[PDB]
Structure formats: structure tokens, C-alpha cells
Amino acid sequence: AKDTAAGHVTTPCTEILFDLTLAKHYENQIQAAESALNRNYAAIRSWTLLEAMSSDGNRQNAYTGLIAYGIQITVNAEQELQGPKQTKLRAAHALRHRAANLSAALQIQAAQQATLTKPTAGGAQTPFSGATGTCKYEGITATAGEQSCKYSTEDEEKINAAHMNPEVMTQITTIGDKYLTTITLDAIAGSKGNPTQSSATYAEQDCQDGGNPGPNFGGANALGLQVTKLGTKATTEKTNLYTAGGTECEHQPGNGPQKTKQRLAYLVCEANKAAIITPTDLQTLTLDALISAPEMAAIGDALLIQQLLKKAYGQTNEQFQKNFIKPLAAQTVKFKSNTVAALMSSPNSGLALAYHKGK
Amino acid sequence: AKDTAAGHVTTPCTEILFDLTLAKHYENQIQAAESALNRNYAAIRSWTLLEAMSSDGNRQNAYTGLIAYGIQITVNAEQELQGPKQTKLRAAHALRHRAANLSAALQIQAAQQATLTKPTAGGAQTPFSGATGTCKYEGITATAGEQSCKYSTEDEEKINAAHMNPEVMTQITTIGDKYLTTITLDAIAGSKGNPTQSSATYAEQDCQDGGNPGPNFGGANALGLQVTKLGTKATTEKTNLYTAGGTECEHQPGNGPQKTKQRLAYLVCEANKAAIITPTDLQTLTLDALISAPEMAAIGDALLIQQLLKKAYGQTNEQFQKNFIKPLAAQTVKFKSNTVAALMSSPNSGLALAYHKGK
Ligand SMILES: *[C@@H]1O[C@H](CO)[C@@H](O[C@@H]2O[C@H](CO)[C@@H](O[C@@H]3O[C@H](CO[C@H]4O[C@H](CO)[C@@H](O)[C@H](O)[C@@H]4O)[C@@H](O)[C@H](O[C@H]4O[C@H](CO)[C@@H](O)[C@H](O)[C@@H]4O[C@H]4O[C@H](CO)[C@@H](O)[C@H](O)[C@@H]4O)[C@@H]3O)[C@H](O)[C@H]2NC(C)=O)[C@H](O)[C@H]1NC(C)=O
Ligand SMILES: *[C@@H]1O[C@H](CO)[C@@H](O[C@@H]2O[C@H](CO)[C@@H](O[C@@H]3O[C@H](CO[C@H]4O[C@H](CO)[C@@H](O)[C@H](O)[C@@H]4O)[C@@H](O)[C@H](O[C@H]4O[C@H](CO)[C@@H](O)[C@H](O)[C@@H]4O[C@H]4O[C@H](CO)[C@@H](O)[C@H](O)[C@@H]4O)[C@@H]3O)[C@H](O)[C@H]2NC(C)=O)[C@H](O)[C@H]1NC(C)=O
């Protein structure tokens, strides 16, 4: 189904959640690819130690073949990751920036009740040069308590990385810009009698004199105003990621001024298109994956073709695991103690290699 | 001198610049350390190829010693980087979040001129149950054009990574929270005559009747209000990074509610304390740096002590550079073509190794 996550964005808080969840999805895709590279480099260090520890030329050549394979695919994958990584990080950064902006706006747009100050009475004065009474208030303020976004179980289910694979995303939903830019308020003035500069009894936060000044314009003459509410209403808007044909990103930059929603849509589209390719996980390699790997044809030809690969690595995956995979975790190495893979990722890694290459 | 950069923060825009400049400084420290690691791993791949290409056992052992050294120091440095990296990224993320917040607030606090709507006249009505005239305005708004921060040459000189080494930073300066939270406005009411529900001539964005209604309360009876300005004034505040003794971070979390400035100060202090250690640059290694390296004592003992190291690597740095450093950039490798270091960081890296290990 398309757009489950964006179609649940109906409020400032749900846009925030979408933006941060999608940013974290892109960041997690990069972290997962880098973790995979680091696992592969760890495997290569482990096989380098095992090569140094074997005395059989054919077993040594087999380890060399796994080192060579590993270096080739992992160096390549690390190079190929960089473009998608930068694309995805540009979008993650922008999404986090937007979510920050919107959260800050939310706090201000929650300031919906005003505190009046004590006014000063006058007669005619700017901007009412024709008035006989004025009541002037300076520094009326509105502030809210600390706001927070509260999410339901379903909000977190629907606005979730599980719904943010590229094949399902066609649009983003954003709050209209006026929520970010505009202060909105209602206000009312009230008059009784003949208010003038002498209406200087201010106990009710208005200007009164005559009679018995008091609550609800008790006095003979009164003038006042109240700001009865503030706050701009949020609206939502939809922006397509792709052009009509569905391939190309809409909202490419450089074609004229753009709105926030259009810049975000472009970045999201490009980050969705920039798919990451992860290489094989060397630490869990199977025999069939090794001998079917395209890079192993030339590597095998150089060191030893699929017939030759089985002779070196095993006729069964059981044999392959036994000889080339299980030793990473289970084989202890002691000299003057740790298992192969942990040792070759530890502070003694290089020394372990020097020691066994020397012995 | 202390606090050149924070002492130039006097405005919202200069706080933004400080926050983003310091975030980028931390991000650049991490990028520089990772670049250094990647250069070292590239050198290790290069020496692995040269080991495979030599036929002299003693030259082979020498390359093995550089591989072992490189692995040890680079794996260690990569492990040791992770804690400081995470600390520095927590601060960079928070600084960028703050700068976003403040930029969003700046846009709203620039909305300083109101647009009045056409009012509706009444008599007594809430919140003026004692009035004889009211003039009620709904949806008064204030919006600014797109704001931007403009920096002088000196702003960029003083609020600069060159002034953000830890030894010079004792405090941060931040805008007061009210700029982020509070709407401020001035407003004035004006009255003439006996305004009532019949004061329903609205051409001047006030309530008039009687006589000849017009500009400046031309009519006999008038009531109106104007919002004459909006905007909350920025203030600045200083927060110390360290406790009085100067070692420990002030504002540790977990001791009670904190303000934004205190959370930021804590994160900045921890990111400043979490110094990164970069290992030696293997691609520009000198002979004296190699034989003075502590790790080379055991590695040399294992493969070959400083006397033995000079026998393997050269009695002069000229000889060392000739035999072990210059070949990385200058030695061409061809088989069925590239220089050593570029080849071992290219898509043919592993195959180049397999080819020469087989030949
Ligand atoms: C989070 O919220 C913040 C706060 O509101 C918001 O920040 C604002 O971002 C906008 C968009 O980036 C910033 O506006 C940019 O401002 C610069 C600088 O303008 C000043 O300085 C230049 C001199 O360098 C003067 O020319 C100018 O008069 C100002 O004094 C502009 O250079 C940017 O221009 C481009 O975009 C404009 C529309 O936004 C166009 O009108 C303009 O022509 C430019 O577009 C063209 O060039 C683009 C680049 O080549 C191109 O891609 C376009 O297609 C087109 O060809 C722009 O005006 C604004 O200053 C920020 N405000 C503050 C207070 O920081 C964040 O955007 C928001 N973030 C998210 C992700 O939601
Ligand atoms: C950019 O601008 C944004 C927008 O203003 C701003 O976001 C706001 O950040 C604050 C600070 O993080 C957020 O406040 C936090 O809100 C949570 C959630 O509160 C709700 O939900 C909980 C249930 O989980 C309810 O209990 C609660 O009643 C609310 O309904 C709170 O859990 C956080 O509490 C800690 O900090 C408070 C003070 O801020 C304390 O009063 C509270 O006791 C907690 O502190 C204690 O626990 C801490 C953690 O263990 C500990 O370190 C302390 O020392 C202490 O022991 C907090 O209230 C707020 O919701 C965000 N607003 C929105 C709209 O997103 C960003 O902070 C700002 N960023 C930057 C970097 O400038």
C-alpha cells in the first residue's frame, strides 16, 4: 500500500514524528552498511592471521583467496557507499532541521492566552488623533507551558521505518508555512460613557473614572481592550516526490524559488532513489556463495575453475564452515590468549600477526 | 585568550553562527580522524601487495612488520575514537537543534507589524459585560518577510573554529528563553462619542456612526483598537562549562530540571574534554618515527632491537623512504595497470593481491 506513514501526518506533532523517523531510517541504513563493512574488514584481519599460522601451501593459498575476495568486495562496497551516504545524510539533516523548526513553532503557537499589563489613559494620541479617550497597553504577553508531543500506539506503528521503504513512498505531508511565520490573535475594545485622560483608575486593567470604578466597567466612564485569544491554526499540504512519469524527482533545485516542502520532497526523493548495496557478509559466507561469486573466478584462476575452488574450499558447506568460518570464533590463539576474530580486532592484533609470521 | 568566540555572541544571529560553527568543528574533528584511519588502512593494503611482490625473505619480513604495526595502531585508534566520536556528535546534534530553534524563533519575532481585520460593532458582550460599545476584531495577524542572518568579516573571524580549541573555552552565551516562548505586543483602544452596536461603518477598520464617518474618527461616535507593535526582545545569558575547580563539567544531568543553556553547556564541556588521539600517518612515516614507536619493539623482536630495525628498514630516512614509502605512489603494477596505493584502493585491489601471491 502506498503512503501509510505520510498519510498519518495530520498534525504538527505527527509531522515531527514522520520527519525524525525518516531521518533515523536513512541514518540507520548508513550505520547498517558501515557495520557490514567493518565486519568484513574484521574477517579479512582474521584470515590474515590464519594464513600466517598455516604451514600448508594449499591451505595458505585458500586463505589468501578469501583475503583477496574480501578486500575486493569490501573496498568496492565502501567506495560505492559514499554517494548514497551523502545523499541520504543531506535528507536526514534537512528532516531533522524541519522537525526542530516545527517543534519551536509549536511552542510559540501554543501561547494562546494573553496577560494584560496595567494601561495608561490618554486623550487624543497616535494612532487615534480623533479620539477623546485612549487606553494604551504596553508589553502584553502570551506564553505557554512546556509543550510536548504525545503519540498513540497506532501513531508509532504507522509512522514507522517499516513503512518507509522506497517502493511505498510517493508524497510527503507538511504543515503550512503560516504556522511557522504568522502570529494570529483576536481582540476587542470596550467603551462606556466619556473616557478621557482622567479615566486613570486602573484596578481592572482598563481605564475608568467617575462614579464607583470597578469590575465590569463599574465606573461612569470606561475604556479597555482585551486580547481574547492567540494562535495560528495548522494546515496540511501534500507534495509529490516524483514527476508524473514516476521515475524522476520533482522539485529539482535551480529552476526558481522553492518552498520548504518542495526542497524536502526533493531530498527525500533523492535519498529514496540512492539505494545502498551491501556486499556479502564474509563472516557468514557459505561455500556456494563463495564459488558462485563472480570475483572468485579470476581470484581462483590466479591462485589455483569452480572445480578448483571446491578442491581448495571444500566439496560441502560443512567442510567449508569447518575449515574457514568456524575457526574465527572458536580457535584460540595463545602467545607471550584470545580467539582468532577477537584477537585480530583487539590491541594485540598486529603483534599476533608479527609473532606468527616470525614463527 | 579565553572565550573570543562566545564573547562575540550578542544577538540571535551570532548565537546561531556560534552554534553551527562549533557543531561543524566537532564534526570536522571526527572526519579528520576517520580520514586518517582510512589513509592508514590504505597503506596497509599497499604494503600487503608489496609483500606479495617481493622474493627476498628479509624484505618480505620488513613489509610484514609495517603491516603488523599499521594494523595494531589503526585498529586501536579506531576503537579509541568511538567514545569521543559519540560524545562530540551528541553535542553537534544539540547545537544544530538549538540553532534551528533559534532561527525559527527569529522568523516569528520579526513579525512586528500587524494587519487589522474589519471589525464588528456590538454593545455589551463578553469580556465587557458593562460596555455600551464594543468593537471586535477576529484574526488580526502579523507576518514578516523571509529573515536572514548577515555576518560581518569580523563576526566570521571571531566566531570561528580557530577560536574553539578546548583550552580557550570556559562558557557559552545563549539567548534567553523568552525569545523562544513568548509573544509580546503593544495595543491601544480609542473612543469618541457614544459608540454602540449601531457604529457599523467599518471603512477605517474601526467602528463608527453618526455625523460623517471617516479617517481619524471622523464620525460622531467611534471605537477602535490597533496593535501598534509586536516582538519580544532578545536577551543574552552566560553559562559556565566547568565547575569552580575547572576540571569537571558543570550542569551534569540527573540532578533536577535543567534549562536549555545548561544542557548545552554540559554537552559542550564533555565534547571539549573528549579529545581525539590520532595515530601516526603511515603513508608519511619516517624511519625515526618507526624505530621510536613503542609497538615496534615487540614487532621487531617477533620478526627480526632498534639495531635490528635499522638493518631491516634502513640506516637513513632516505633509504627508508626509498624502499618502503615512495613505492606506494610511484611504483606501477601491471597485469592481465596502476600505481601500488591507488590499485590497492581500487576495484582490482583484491585481484592484484591474488595475482601476485599466485605468481
Ligand atoms: C528552518 O527554519 C529556518 C528559519 O525560518 C529556515 O531558514 C531560512 O531558510 C531560508 C531558505 O534557505 C533562508 O533563505 C535563503 O536566504 C539566502 C540569503 O539571503 C540573504 O542573503 C543574500 C545574499 O547572499 C541576499 O541575496 C538576500 O537578499 C538576503 O539578504 C538566500 O540567498 C536564499 O535564496 C534562494 O532561495 C530563495 C527562496 O527561499 C529564492 O528567492 C532565491 O532566489 C534563491 O533561490 C535560487 O537560488 C537557489 C540556490 O541556487 C536555487 O536552488 C533556487 O532554485 C533559485 O534558483 C534563501 O533566500 C533564510 O534566510 C533562512 N532564515 C534564517 C532566519 O535562517 C530553514 O529553511 C528551515 N529549514 C527547514 C529544512 O525546514
Ligand atoms: C528546541 O526547541 C524544542 C521545542 O521547544 C525543544 O523541545 C522540548 O524539549 C524539552 C526538553 O527535552 C521537552 O521536554 C521534555 O518533555 C518530556 C516529555 O514530557 C511529557 O511526557 C512525559 C511522559 O514521558 C510526562 O511526564 C510529561 O508530563 C509530559 O507530558 C519530559 O519527560 C522531559 O523531562 C525532563 O526535563 C524536564 C525539564 O525540561 C524536567 O522537569 C523533568 O523532571 C525531566 O528531568 C528530569 O529527568 C531528566 C532525564 O532523566 C534529568 O536529566 C533531569 O536532570 C531531571 O532529573 C522534558 O520535560 C519538550 O517536550 C520539547 N518540546 C517539544 C514541543 O518538542 C528542544 O529542547 C530545543 N532543543 C535545543 C537543543 O535547544
Coordinates of N, CA, C and O and ligand atoms in Angstrom, one line a residue, chain A residues 15 93-102 180-181 252-261 263-264 267, chain B residues 13 16 99-108 146-151, ligand 1:
Chain A
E15 N 3.8 15.3 12.0 CA 4.8 15.7 11.0 C 6.2 15.6 11.6 O 7.1 15.0 11.0
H93 N 19.6 15.4 7.5 CA 19.9 16.6 8.1 C 18.7 17.6 7.9 O 18.3 18.3 8.9
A94 N 18.1 17.7 6.7 CA 17.1 18.6 6.4 C 15.8 18.2 7.2 O 15.1 19.1 7.6
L95 N 15.5 16.9 7.3 CA 14.4 16.4 8.0 C 14.4 16.8 9.5 O 13.5 17.2 10.1
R96 N 15.6 16.6 10.1 CA 15.8 17.0 11.5 C 15.7 18.5 11.7 O 15.2 19.0 12.7
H97 N 16.2 19.3 10.7 CA 16.1 20.7 10.8 C 14.6 21.2 10.7 O 14.2 22.0 11.5
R98 N 13.9 20.6 9.8 CA 12.4 20.8 9.8 C 11.7 20.5 11.1 O 10.9 21.2 11.5
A99 N 12.0 19.3 11.6 CA 11.3 18.9 12.8 C 11.7 19.8 14.0 O 10.8 20.1 14.8
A100 N 12.9 20.3 14.0 CA 13.2 21.3 15.0 C 12.4 22.6 14.9 O 11.8 23.1 15.8
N101 N 12.4 23.1 13.6 CA 11.7 24.3 13.3 C 10.2 24.1 13.8 O 9.6 25.0 14.4
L102 N 9.6 23.0 13.4 CA 8.2 22.8 13.7 C 7.9 22.7 15.2 O 6.9 23.2 15.7
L180 N 4.6 28.5 10.8 CA 6.0 28.9 11.1 C 6.2 30.4 11.1 O 7.1 30.9 11.8
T181 N 5.4 31.2 10.5 CA 5.6 32.6 10.2 C 4.7 33.6 10.8 O 5.1 34.8 10.9
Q252 N 13.4 19.5 -8.5 CA 14.8 19.7 -8.6 C 15.1 21.2 -8.3 O 14.4 22.1 -8.8
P253 N 16.2 21.5 -7.6 CA 16.6 22.9 -7.4 C 17.2 23.5 -8.6 O 17.5 22.9 -9.6
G254 N 17.2 24.9 -8.6 CA 17.9 25.6 -9.7 C 16.9 26.1 -10.7 O 17.4 26.7 -11.7
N255 N 15.6 25.9 -10.5 CA 14.6 26.3 -11.5 C 13.7 27.5 -11.1 O 12.7 27.7 -11.7
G256 N 14.1 28.2 -10.0 CA 13.3 29.2 -9.4 C 13.2 29.0 -7.9 O 13.5 28.0 -7.4
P257 N 12.6 30.0 -7.2 CA 12.4 29.9 -5.8 C 11.5 28.7 -5.5 O 10.6 28.4 -6.1
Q258 N 11.8 28.1 -4.3 CA 11.1 26.9 -3.8 C 10.7 27.2 -2.4 O 11.3 27.9 -1.7
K259 N 9.6 26.5 -2.1 CA 9.1 26.4 -0.7 C 9.8 25.3 0.1 O 10.3 24.3 -0.5
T260 N 9.7 25.3 1.4 CA 10.3 24.3 2.2 C 9.8 22.9 1.8 O 10.6 22.0 1.7
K261 N 8.5 22.7 1.6 CA 8.0 21.4 1.3 C 8.6 20.8 0.0 O 8.8 19.7 -0.1
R263 N 11.7 21.7 -1.3 CA 13.1 21.3 -1.0 C 13.1 19.9 -0.3 O 13.9 19.1 -0.6
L264 N 12.2 19.7 0.7 CA 12.2 18.5 1.4 C 11.8 17.3 0.5 O 12.4 16.2 0.6
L267 N 14.8 16.2 -1.6 CA 15.8 15.5 -0.9 C 15.4 14.1 -0.5 O 16.2 13.2 -0.5
Chain B
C13 N 21.4 36.0 15.8 CA 22.2 35.6 14.7 C 23.6 35.1 15.0 O 24.1 34.2 14.4
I16 N 23.4 31.7 16.6 CA 23.2 30.7 15.6 C 24.6 30.4 15.0 O 25.0 29.2 14.7
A99 N 20.4 25.8 17.1 CA 20.4 26.8 16.0 C 19.2 26.9 15.2 O 18.7 27.9 14.8
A100 N 18.6 25.7 14.9 CA 17.4 25.6 14.2 C 16.3 26.3 15.0 O 15.5 27.1 14.4
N101 N 16.1 25.9 16.2 CA 15.1 26.5 17.1 C 15.2 28.0 17.0 O 14.2 28.7 16.9
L102 N 16.4 28.6 17.3 CA 16.6 30.0 17.3 C 16.3 30.7 16.0 O 15.7 31.8 16.0
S103 N 16.6 30.1 14.9 CA 16.3 30.6 13.6 C 14.8 30.7 13.4 O 14.3 31.6 12.8
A104 N 14.1 29.7 13.8 CA 12.6 29.6 13.7 C 12.0 30.7 14.6 O 11.1 31.4 14.2
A105 N 12.5 30.8 15.8 CA 12.0 31.9 16.6 C 12.3 33.3 16.1 O 11.5 34.1 16.2
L106 N 13.5 33.5 15.5 CA 13.8 34.7 14.9 C 12.8 35.1 13.8 O 12.4 36.3 13.8
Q107 N 12.4 34.2 13.0 CA 11.4 34.5 12.0 C 10.1 35.0 12.6 O 9.5 35.9 12.1
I108 N 9.6 34.3 13.7 CA 8.4 34.7 14.3 C 8.6 36.1 15.0 O 7.7 36.9 15.0
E146 N 10.9 36.9 4.7 CA 11.9 35.9 5.0 C 13.1 36.6 5.6 O 13.7 37.5 5.0
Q147 N 13.4 36.2 6.8 CA 14.6 36.8 7.5 C 15.8 36.0 7.2 O 15.8 34.9 6.9
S148 N 17.0 36.7 7.3 CA 18.3 36.1 7.1 C 19.2 36.7 8.1 O 19.2 37.9 8.4
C149 N 20.2 35.9 8.5 CA 21.3 36.5 9.3 C 22.5 36.9 8.4 O 22.9 36.1 7.5
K150 N 22.9 38.1 8.6 CA 24.0 38.7 7.9 C 25.2 38.8 8.8 O 25.0 39.3 9.9
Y151 N 26.3 38.4 8.4 CA 27.6 38.4 9.2 C 28.6 39.3 8.6 O 28.8 39.3 7.4
Ligands
LIG1 C1 14.0 26.1 9.3 O1 13.6 27.4 9.6 C2 14.6 28.3 9.3 C3 14.1 29.7 9.9 O2 13.0 30.2 9.2 C4 14.7 28.3 7.7 O3 15.8 29.2 7.5 C5 15.6 30.1 6.3 O4 16.0 29.3 5.2 C6 15.8 30.0 4.0 C7 15.9 29.0 2.9 O5 17.2 28.6 2.9 C8 16.8 31.1 4.0 O6 16.7 31.9 2.8 C9 17.8 31.8 2.0 O7 18.5 33.1 2.3 C10 19.6 33.3 1.5 C11 20.3 34.5 1.9 O8 19.5 35.7 1.6 C12 20.1 36.9 2.1 O9 21.4 37.0 1.6 C13 21.5 37.0 0.2 C14 23.0 37.3 -0.2 O10 23.7 36.1 -0.2 C15 20.7 38.1 -0.4 O11 20.7 38.0 -1.8 C16 19.3 38.1 0.1 O12 18.5 39.3 -0.3 C17 19.3 38.0 1.6 O13 19.8 39.2 2.2 C18 19.2 33.3 0.0 O14 20.4 33.5 -0.8 C19 18.4 32.1 -0.4 O15 17.9 32.2 -1.8 C20 17.4 31.1 -2.6 O16 16.1 30.7 -2.2 C21 15.1 31.8 -2.2 C22 13.8 31.3 -1.7 O17 14.0 30.8 -0.3 C23 15.0 32.4 -3.6 O18 14.0 33.5 -3.6 C24 16.4 32.8 -4.1 O19 16.3 33.3 -5.5 C25 17.3 31.7 -4.1 O20 16.9 30.6 -4.9 C26 17.5 30.5 -6.2 O21 18.8 30.0 -5.8 C27 18.8 28.7 -5.2 C28 20.2 28.2 -4.9 O22 20.9 28.3 -6.2 C29 18.1 27.8 -6.2 O23 18.1 26.4 -5.8 C30 16.7 28.2 -6.4 O24 16.1 27.2 -7.2 C31 16.7 29.5 -7.1 O25 17.3 29.4 -8.4 C32 17.3 32.0 0.5 O26 16.5 33.2 0.4 C33 16.6 32.0 5.2 O27 17.5 33.1 5.2 C34 16.6 31.2 6.5 N1 16.3 32.0 7.6 C35 17.0 32.1 8.7 C36 16.5 33.1 9.7 O28 17.9 31.4 8.9 C37 15.0 26.9 7.2 O29 14.9 26.8 5.8 C38 14.1 25.9 7.8 N2 14.6 24.6 7.4 C39 13.9 23.5 7.1 C40 14.6 22.4 6.5 O30 12.6 23.5 7.2

